[PDB]
UniProtKB/Swiss-Prot annotation:
Constitutively active protein kinase that acts as a negative regulator in the hormonal control of glucose homeostasis, Wnt signaling and regulation of transcription factors and microtubules, by phosphorylating and inactivating glycogen synthase (GYS1 or GYS2), EIF2B, CTNNB1/beta-catenin, APC, AXIN1, DPYSL2/CRMP2, JUN, NFATC1/NFATC, MAPT/TAU and MACF1. Requires primed phosphorylation of the majority of its substrates. In skeletal muscle, contributes to insulin regulation of glycogen synthesis by phosphorylating and inhibiting GYS1 activity and hence glycogen synthesis. GO terms for cellular component: axon; beta-catenin destruction complex; centrosome; cytoplasm; cytosol; dendrite; glutamatergic synapse; mitochondrion. It is found in: Cytoplasm; Nucleus; Cell membrane. Expressed in testis, thymus, prostate and ovary and weakly expressed in lung, brain and kidney. Colocalizes with EIF2AK2/PKR and TAU in the Alzheimer disease (AD) brain. The gene is GSK3B. The modification Phosphotyrosine is found at residue 181. The keyword Hydrolase does not apply. This is Glycogen synthase kinase-3 beta. GO terms for biological process: canonical Wnt signaling pathway; cell differentiation; cellular response to amyloid-beta; cellular response to interleukin-3; cellular response to retinoic acid; circadian rhythm; epithelial to mesenchymal transition; ER overload response. It is an enzyme of class 2 (transferase). It comes from Homo sapiens (Human). The active site is at 146 (proton acceptor).
Length: 348
């Protein structure tokens, strides 16, 4: 079966063209709808189609955001079109996205089940690209709100990483309140658990730190029973937050009645084989005080990733590393001076 739709390019001008695809099969699910895999008749290239029920009255936040983005470390919106569904009054938005099958989650699971550790070189590669993609979106004031291993797609051969699933993403506006119960639980920042509604894109940074730790440990670092137990799991490592730290998180409620627990030193949290740079970076990601956390750009500048800036660095499969230094002014906006560190001599 060959299907044809009138679809508008994602980043291109607003002019619909005919698009044909075949080999359609379901590969994903969610409250939003369904996700298909298909092959374009033109390029024979594989693509994901995210199908979301559309409230014809309101605009789709994910579409808006997706159309603005153009980055190597973000899954790009090829096309979008509309279709019919069930009732005669229902309209579905379809997002035609890059198809990348492997995920940081599956990759990390293979290692975890083999009682093995993911080689630090990959940790650096993956985390660096994640921080770069976050630096990009944050420069637009856009927060992802769902950073987790499942949302990090991997090309196993090039070690290119791409951020996906902007269904929870939003452009944060100082003054306007945001929902607190957001993000996947293990990767949920502490302020969110405190019911904060005036939070910043630094919640993504917390999430990223959770991913790093998980990759270093072989399992989630804060595996909470629930949204509230999530805080207990956190406390059992960072120790009870101080009254000032709690104040910083902008709480809607603090009546938790948590028992007094002392911090567990980072060096003790990880395997002894763990590089200090990784521990050091982690400790400045997972901080109670939101403003105390590194920005993605600073994180990219961290020493943990120095090896990546070495002119001789190579992928374990012998190939060259993906392009990591081709920054744009947009990307460096939050702190241009960092270019000195981010863009190395040999790269210029
Ligand atoms: C939406 C997200 N889904 C997906 C699943 C498997 C492979 N690639 C994908 N691309 C995506 O954007
Ligand atoms: Cl490789």
């Amino acid at each position: 079966k060959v299907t044809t739709v009138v679809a508008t390019p994602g980043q291109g001008p607003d002019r619909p063209q005919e698009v044909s695809y075949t080999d359609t099969k379901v590969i994903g699910n969610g409250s939003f709808g369904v996700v298909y895999q298909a092959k374009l008749c033109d390029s024979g290239e594989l693509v994901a189609i995210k199908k979301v029920l559309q409230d014809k009255r309101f605009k789709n936040r994910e579409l808006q955001i997706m159309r603005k983005l153009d980055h190597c470390n973000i899954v790009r919106l090829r096309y979008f079109f509309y279709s019919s569904g069930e009732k005669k009054d229902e309209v579905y938005l379809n997002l035609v996205l890059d198809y990348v099958p492997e995920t940081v989650y599956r990759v990390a699971r293979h290692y975890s089940r083999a009682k093995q550790t993911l080689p630090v070189i990959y940790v650096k590669l993956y985390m660096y690209q994640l921080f770069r993609s976050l630096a990009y979106i944050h420069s637009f004031g856009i927060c992802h709100r769902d950073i987790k291993p499942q949302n990090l797609l991997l090309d196993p051969d090039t070690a290119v990483l791409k951020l996906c699933d902007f269904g929870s993403a939003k452009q944060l506006v100082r003054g306007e309140p945001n929902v607190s119960y957001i993000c996947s639980r293990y990767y949920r920042a502490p302020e969110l658990i405190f019911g904060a509604t005036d939070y910043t894109s630094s919640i993504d940074v917390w999430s990223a730190g959770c991913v790093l730790a998980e990759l270093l440990l072989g399992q989630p670092i804060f595996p909470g029973d629930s949204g509230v137990d999530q805080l207990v799991e956190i406390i059992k490592v960072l120790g009870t937050p101080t009254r000032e730290q709690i104040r910083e998180m902008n709480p809607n409620y603090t009546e938790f009645k948590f028992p007094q627990i002392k911090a567990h030193p980072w060096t003790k949290v990880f395997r002894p084989r763990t590089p200090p740079e990784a521990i050091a970076l982690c400790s400045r990601l997972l901080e109670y005080t939101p403003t105390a956390r590194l920005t993605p750009l600073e994180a990219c500048a961290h020493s943990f990733f120095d090896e990546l800036r070495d002119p001789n660095v190579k992928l374990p499969n012998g190939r060259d590393t993906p392009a990591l230094f081709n920054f744009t002014t947009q990307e460096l906006s939050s702190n241009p001076p960092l270019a000195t560190i981010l863009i190395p001599p040999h790269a210029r």
